[PDB]
């Protein structure tokens, strides 16, 4: 009923009035209605037909109104330049004002919705040569921002991931970026991004949205493919580090770590457990999994990384704290 296009009607007068009401609200939009208009749209872009129609409508209306692709991606590029220009007392950091933060969040939620329900909108927004949303969003995660914003960025990244070839390119960029410190970064000690933020900022705030988001992204990525040869030249080819990180850190925190909200204690568990499940489901035992090779990394003969399933099983058929924690989890449930 919000979209004016044997039975389909020549646009009914009610439909036309409603479409005009949607368009009339966008002309000379005051600053105070910039958020509720965005959330109204986010509410209108469900029902894939409706999603596509509103996508095209609001893409054309921004063909200046503060609601348009150029404005969004230009604002992102400006915030990126300004956050990179204060990297090491740089000019007192214009830590995004709470209002601008909520604006960016509403925008990214609307984008997630639209590219979830309309695959054509996904392929259309990913490839626009001027906006380049994937590189801009992957460049902004490396900057210091509040956690909620990193969570919204990761949800958007996930929605852009429900398309196969984008997934292969995305794995490429994720491990060339070192968002999760996989190569010992010249003596990495304990992580650069996810690990450190989780241990120090998230654990202190007593809320863990960043970790839930990163696990969700790993889940979506492994669905479309357990990727192969994630790294060469740097590190050793395999999906071992992401697994090690997930398992160790998230199961620890499952046990003992302060949560302001009581419910958040279970969400973390469920999120990492889902990826454990999807990692074990596809592991079909082959006669080559039980042969292991030793790769010479930095002159230290280290056992290679067997498939995720081999190591996800060999720790299950003994009494490793994985099994103990699983039984304890069933007991608690």
């Amino acid at each position: 009923e919000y979209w004016c296009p044997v039975a389909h009607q020549r646009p009914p007068q009610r439909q036309v009035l409603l479409s005009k009401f949607v368009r009339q609200m966008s002309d000379l939009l005051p600053a105070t209605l910039y958020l509720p208009y965005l959330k109204m749209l986010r509410g209108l872009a469900s029902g894939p037909q409706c999603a596509h129609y509103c996508f095209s409508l609001l893409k054309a209306n921004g063909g200046g109104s503060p609601v348009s692709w150029d404005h969004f991606f230009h604002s992102l590029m400006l915030y990126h330049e300004h956050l990179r220009r204060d990297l090491p007392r740089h000019p007192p950091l214009r830590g995004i004002t709470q209002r601008e933060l909520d604006g960016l969040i509403a925008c990214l939620q609307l984008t997630c919705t639209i590219i979830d329900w309309s695959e054509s909108a996904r392929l259309a927004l990913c490839e626009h040569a001027q906006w380049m949303p994937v590189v801009v969003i992957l460049g902004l995660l490396q900057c210091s921002i509040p956690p909620l914003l990193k969570a919204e960025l990761l949800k958007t990244l996930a929605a852009f991931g429900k398309s196969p070839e984008i997934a292969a390119s995305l794995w490429q960029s994720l491990e060339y970026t070192q968002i999760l410190q996989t190569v010992r970064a010249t003596g990495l000690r304990q992580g650069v991004g996810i690990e450190v933020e989780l241990n120090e900022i998230e654990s202190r705030c007593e809320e863990y949205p960043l970790t839930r988001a990163f696990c969700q992204l790993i889940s979506t990525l492994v669905e479309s493919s357990f990727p192969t040869n994630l790294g060469a030249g740097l590190r050793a080819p395999g999906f071992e580090p992401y697994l090690q990180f997930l398992r160790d850190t998230v199961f620890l925190r499952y046990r003992t770590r302060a949560y302001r909200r009581a419910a958040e204690k279970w969400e973390v568990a469920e999120a990492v457990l889902d990826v454990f499940y999807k990692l074990l489901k596809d592991y079909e035992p082959q006669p080559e999994d039980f042969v292991d090779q030793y790769v010479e990394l930095q002159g230290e003969e280290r056992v290679a990384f067997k498939p995720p399933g081999f190591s996800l099983m060999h720790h299950l058929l003994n009494e490793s704290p994985m099994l103990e924690l699983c039984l304890s989890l069933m007991e608690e449930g």
Partner: protein
Amino acid sequence: DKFAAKFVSHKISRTRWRPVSASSLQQPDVFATGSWDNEENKVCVWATDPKQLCDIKHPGDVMDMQFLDKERIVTGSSTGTVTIFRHHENNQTLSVNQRWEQAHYHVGSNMRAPCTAIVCSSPEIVSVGEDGRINCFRAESRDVLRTIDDADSSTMHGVTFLRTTEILTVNSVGQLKLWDLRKQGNDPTQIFSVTGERVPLHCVDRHPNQQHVVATGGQDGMLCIWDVRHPMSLLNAHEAEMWEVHFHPSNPDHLFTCSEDGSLWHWDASQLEITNLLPLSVNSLDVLGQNLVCGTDAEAIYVTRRLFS
């Protein structure tokens, strides 16, 4: 019954297990001990009665010992010299790697100053001392990277890496100082102290998971739980000085406190359940899963492999 006591001839000051790989389901078996109060002190490595594998004549007294990695052991002498030993497993031989002879020396005067404590985050070795000095080195650097001179007029007893590039140090006058290794100034960021009291603090430990929980021990044998962001809890325990406090690495809900009265108490959070594990003075302890080892001044090593049975 659980503890098997093997009597050696050197008072045991430090006991530390060799870090085990998490991915492999192996059980820690090799631990290291250091000895004090003797003419010729030494650093030994034992395997679980425990049988000694290899030992090396350590110059001076072994005050503090930390395992850098599986093959490197960093020991702090009583002459201030910080040394690294390389363990060759194939030949069971400990060899000298790198040393900083004058890491700690008193200002101006001749003679030497003891190195009280060391902490390690590969490849960073931060060593405090009796003199006001927080010298920081690197595994391969022949020179000292940074020296915070005159950091503390009073003797500093312990050190630990709060977060990263930040260290918490306790001193003889009862002050917990938060330091920063990035700021070029020689002044502490914050100083946490009990109002009115100057009871010296001997030990300090940080919760394995949450970084804001720090547990310290004083000469009054009291466990004080601190929150670096906000002492939250003062717990009455021993009737004598608490030399060392250690959180259980795998399951932090367990805590072990050793005192000179001779009591290796165990605190269980999972109403705190306090029990006496041992029947002269217990100096050090190290726990890793189900295996615990403690060394006493009675020249004895007590090892258990079924701690929670």
